[PDB]
Amino acid sequence: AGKKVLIVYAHQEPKSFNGSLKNVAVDELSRQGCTVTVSDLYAMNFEPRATDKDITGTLSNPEVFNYGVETHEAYKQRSLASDITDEQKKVREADLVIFQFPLYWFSVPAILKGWMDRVLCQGFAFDIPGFYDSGLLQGKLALLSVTTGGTAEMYTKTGVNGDSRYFLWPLQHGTLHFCGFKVLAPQISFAPEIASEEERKGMVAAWSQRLQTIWKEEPIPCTAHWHFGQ
Amino acid sequence: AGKKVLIVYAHQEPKSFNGSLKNVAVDELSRQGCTVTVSDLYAMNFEPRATDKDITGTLSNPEVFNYGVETHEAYKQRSLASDITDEQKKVREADLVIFQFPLYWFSVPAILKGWMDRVLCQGFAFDIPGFYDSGLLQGKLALLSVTTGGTAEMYTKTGVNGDSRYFLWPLQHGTLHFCGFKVLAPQISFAPEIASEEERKGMVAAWSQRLQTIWKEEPIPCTAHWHFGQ
Ligand SMILES: Cc1cc2nc3c(=O)[nH]c(=O)nc-3n(C[C@H](O)[C@H](O)[C@H](O)COP(=O)(O)OP(=O)(O)OC[C@H]3O[C@@H](n4cnc5c(N)ncnc54)[C@H](O)[C@@H]3O)c2cc1C
Ligand SMILES: Cc1cc2nc3c(=O)[nH]c(=O)nc-3n(C[C@H](O)[C@H](O)[C@H](O)COP(=O)(O)OP(=O)(O)OC[C@H]3O[C@@H](n4cnc5c(N)ncnc54)[C@H](O)[C@@H]3O)c2cc1C
Ligand SMILES: COc1cc2c(C)cc(=O)n(C)c2c(OC)c1OC
Ligand SMILES: COc1cc2c(C)cc(=O)n(C)c2c(OC)c1OC
Ligand SMILES: [Zn+2]
Ligand SMILES: [Zn+2]
């Protein structure tokens, strides 16, 4: 205490189940006295494509464009597009980053994928070496709050979709752990469109209630064993 | 008569290793007499965001925007935006879809994620009950040709990145199998950047040689067992 939270939110419709989860998060964290910022990606028309427009200085190799090389250089030089550096400041200052989104093809919506591809650049979020437990965002927490079309039963080892933890791997491990975050347990709200009124109201209050005690949680062990079992 | 091939290609640089891989595919499949189309997403400045611009004329429910429902309705009512319907016509006609991209955060670059989100819509690629084995694209083949920054060893079950198959799950199972594709074994070119100009030539040649007998291949068993178990 005090703490800063950044909610990276990816939904088009403010009256949605995602919008309600993001709003109870802002309400609950604000009530506790935390500092809260929301990056509402669709509302910002956030640029998801990794292009040469993300660099505004002299290119290190202006004959063969390599996005990774040019963004890492631009980061050190401070010539990245300012939409990227606005996001990096929010992440740099945050103690906790919550990503709020509907599952799209077992992953994040593209607009949010583009935030991860463009904001978590080398130099800022990781270095080579300086990744996983040595990633540059070490000491920060991150949490996925995901909604699905598919039911909890569908997302079991024997269900048609495989276990829910399987689709978490690229995001929790390959992205967040890689940058050094400690990952808190995912919040997964299954199948709200199918749920009843009471069940949807229960899922919102469960999230709200879990946030009351978020600062007391331990991270998951972000390993293959946690994601896949043995 | 002959097969049709669609290459969805997601790299900013013509001279890159991705670009060479794409150009080998075009040349080899063209040599064989195949009908070949390339979707060069970055050259198309392809839109990755799922927004209400994806639907033309007036919305099914203009008070609460639900992207899934509205694009399903627009597909059935021939009211989708023409960047999406252009891609769908290329997919509908294809016998094989090859995706050629660098791995970004254990997944596809956001421009390519936005093509999957937007082009593979309900009523086109899947519905109730056409999903998994009965998905609407049954009978077509799909193939991921991925390049990585990480080495083959980093991508083992007990290596730092875990098994390559772990990241393949959301793309191969959650997306391509879900839509009914039969999925061919992925082509993975590990760590081209850490050379040599010989292993590089050799990875390119292997890809060109594999495309020679691409039509004789059997699809993988696209199962939790293939990705995760023994
Ligand atoms: C391109 C695409 C890909 C997808 N891929 C997958 C996938 O791979 N796997 C999968 O399982 N699903 C997938 N889906 C389905 C998607 O994940 C779900 O449709 C989404 O998670 C539901 O969240 P929502 O906020 O949009 O729900 P909504 O439709 O907005 O909400 C459902 C109901 O909850 C109501 N609601 C809003 N706020 C409250 C509140 N406070 N209290 C009670 N009710 C409230 C809404 O009014 C609505 O009636 C995909 C969808 C799309 C469009
Ligand atoms: C946002 C971001 C996220 C990333 N996430 C990951 C991740 O999760 N995991 C991971 O492993 N990696 C990741 N990477 C690294 C990325 O996957 C690799 O940089 C990429 O796959 C390399 O492919 P390329 O085509 O750009 O290589 P290039 O740099 O373009 O080429 C490699 C070498 O081969 C040369 N070459 C070109 N054509 C030929 C040819 N015809 N014959 C011989 N040589 C040729 C090139 O000139 C170059 O010297 C990430 C990168 C970025 C930018
Ligand atoms: C592609 O879109 C969707 C995909 C899925 C997938 C892959 C699995 C699943 O269980 N469900 C339930 C989905 C869903 O729910 C409704 C979608 O909604 C549009
Ligand atoms: C985000 O960018 C990158 C990410 C990775 C990840 C997640 C794993 C990995 O093994 N490597 C090798 C990466 C890499 O390679 C150099 C990147 O490029 C800068
Ligand atoms: Zn991990
Ligand atoms: Zn499968």
Side-chain angles (χ1 to χ4, degrees):
Chain A
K3 297 289 192 187
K4 297 209 185 31
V5 190
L6 165 72
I7 303 173
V8 184
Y9 165 72
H11 203 284
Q12 306 92 344
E13 167 57 58
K15 296 170 172 128
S16 61
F17 191 72
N18 279 274
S20 299
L21 292 176
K22 171 277 278 179
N23 293 333
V24 306
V26 162
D27 294 337
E28 176 49 28
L29 299 156
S30 177
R31 183 198 71 74
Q32 278 167 50
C34 303
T35 297
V36 180
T37 310
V38 179
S39 275
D40 172 348
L41 303 178
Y42 288 102
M44 294 157 71
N45 198 39
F46 188 78
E47 177 61 62
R49 313 164 187 88
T51 75
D52 60 20
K53 297 312 94 187
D54 298 343
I55 300 102
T56 78
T58 309
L59 293 155
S60 128
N61 185 342
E63 158 209 357
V64 178
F65 181 69
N66 178 311
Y67 186 80
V69 162
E70 296 299 340
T71 58
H72 175 210
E73 276 320 306
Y75 175 80
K76 298 191 287 169
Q77 293 307 321
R78 314 185 170 125
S79 53
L80 284 172
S82 69
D83 66 330
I84 290 173
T85 57
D86 294 347
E87 293 310 297
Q88 291 179 345
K89 174 168 180 156
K90 287 175 212 178
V91 169
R92 178 184 291 110
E93 301 182 348
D95 299 289
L96 167 58
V97 185
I98 290 169
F99 296 87
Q100 180 59 62
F101 65 88
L103 191 64
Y104 272 16
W105 295 124
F106 282 32
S107 184
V108 297
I111 199 170
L112 180 46
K113 184 56 168 56
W115 186 103
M116 295 153 170
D117 292 347
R118 301 170 68 242
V119 172
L120 307 170
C121 78
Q122 180 172 5
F124 170 66
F126 66 95
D127 224 314
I128 309 289
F131 55 84
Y132 288 122
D133 287 353
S134 301
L136 306 185
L137 305 178
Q138 73 189 57
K140 287 183 198 304
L141 300 169
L143 191 156
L144 309 177
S145 176
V146 194
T147 69
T148 69
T151 63
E153 262 296 319
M154 292 170 79
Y155 285 105
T156 53
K157 181 170 32 59
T158 71
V160 280
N161 290 341
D163 192 63
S164 65
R165 297 193 181 183
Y166 301 163
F167 69 63
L168 294 176
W169 177 250
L171 305 169
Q172 291 187 337
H173 181 76
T175 313
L176 303 165
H177 189 176
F178 184 83
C179 291
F181 287 90
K182 295 195 307 300
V183 172
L184 292 184
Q187 187 70 194
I188 310 184
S189 302
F190 292 99
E193 301 167 293
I194 282 163
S196 65
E197 196 58 31
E198 319 80 65
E199 297 180 307
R200 285 194 294 268
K201 268 168 96 176
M203 286 197 281
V204 184
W207 177 222
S208 192
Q209 188 211 325
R210 166 176 187 199
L211 291 171
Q212 292 174 22
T213 54
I214 199 71
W215 303 105
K216 284 143 179 180
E217 302 191 6
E218 294 289 332
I220 65 162
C222 182
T223 59
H225 177 261
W226 187 91
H227 287 90
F228 313 115
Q230 92 244 243
Chain B
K3 295 292 181 191
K4 304 194 169 53
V5 181
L6 168 66
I7 301 166
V8 180
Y9 158 75
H11 200 289
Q12 308 88 342
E13 171 67 63
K15 297 165 197 163
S16 61
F17 191 78
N18 276 265
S20 294
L21 288 175
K22 178 258 303 172
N23 292 335
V24 146
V26 162
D27 294 336
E28 172 57 19
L29 294 162
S30 183
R31 190 193 67 77
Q32 291 179 30
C34 298
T35 296
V36 179
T37 307
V38 174
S39 286
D40 187 341
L41 304 186
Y42 282 104
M44 300 163 69
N45 194 44
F46 190 77
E47 174 64 61
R49 315 156 183 101
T51 71
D52 69 0
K53 294 181 191 317
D54 290 354
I55 302 89
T56 60
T58 48
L59 293 152
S60 160
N61 180 343
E63 302 301 292
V64 178
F65 181 68
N66 182 309
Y67 184 82
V69 177
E70 295 278 355
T71 57
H72 190 196
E73 285 312 302
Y75 179 82
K76 281 190 309 197
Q77 295 179 250
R78 303 144 320 264
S79 222
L80 284 165
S82 62
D83 65 337
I84 284 163
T85 60
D86 293 355
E87 298 306 299
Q88 292 167 342
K89 179 178 181 213
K90 301 164 195 182
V91 164
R92 187 177 294 114
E93 300 186 353
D95 296 300
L96 170 56
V97 184
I98 302 172
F99 302 87
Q100 178 64 59
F101 61 97
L103 193 61
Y104 278 17
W105 294 125
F106 273 32
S107 184
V108 289
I111 196 165
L112 174 51
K113 186 61 170 40
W115 187 101
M116 293 160 180
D117 301 341
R118 294 169 78 250
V119 172
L120 310 170
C121 78
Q122 191 156 13
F124 171 70
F126 69 87
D127 64 24
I128 160 109
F131 67 79
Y132 287 126
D133 290 352
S134 62
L136 302 177
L137 302 176
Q138 46 172 353
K140 295 187 198 308
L141 300 168
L143 196 171
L144 307 170
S145 184
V146 192
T147 63
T148 66
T151 59
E153 34 94 26
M154 291 167 210
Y155 288 106
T156 53
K157 55 157 278 219
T158 68
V160 299
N161 283 340
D163 200 333
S164 277
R165 306 191 186 185
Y166 298 162
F167 70 73
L168 289 172
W169 175 254
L171 303 173
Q172 288 191 341
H173 183 84
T175 313
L176 293 165
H177 190 167
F178 188 87
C179 291
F181 286 103
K182 314 275 209 294
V183 181
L184 297 187
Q187 182 78 181
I188 299 156
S189 309
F190 287 100
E193 281 163 308
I194 57 176
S196 43
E197 257 293 299
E198 259 140 351
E199 294 153 302
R200 266 186 257 152
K201 299 311 198 39
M203 288 175 279
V204 169
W207 174 224
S208 193
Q209 308 166 325
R210 172 182 183 184
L211 291 170
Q212 295 183 206
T213 45
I214 207 64
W215 310 104
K216 293 292 169 267
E217 289 179 26
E218 271 148 2
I220 57 153
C222 184
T223 57
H225 185 237
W226 185 92
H227 296 80
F228 305 118
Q230 197 73 286

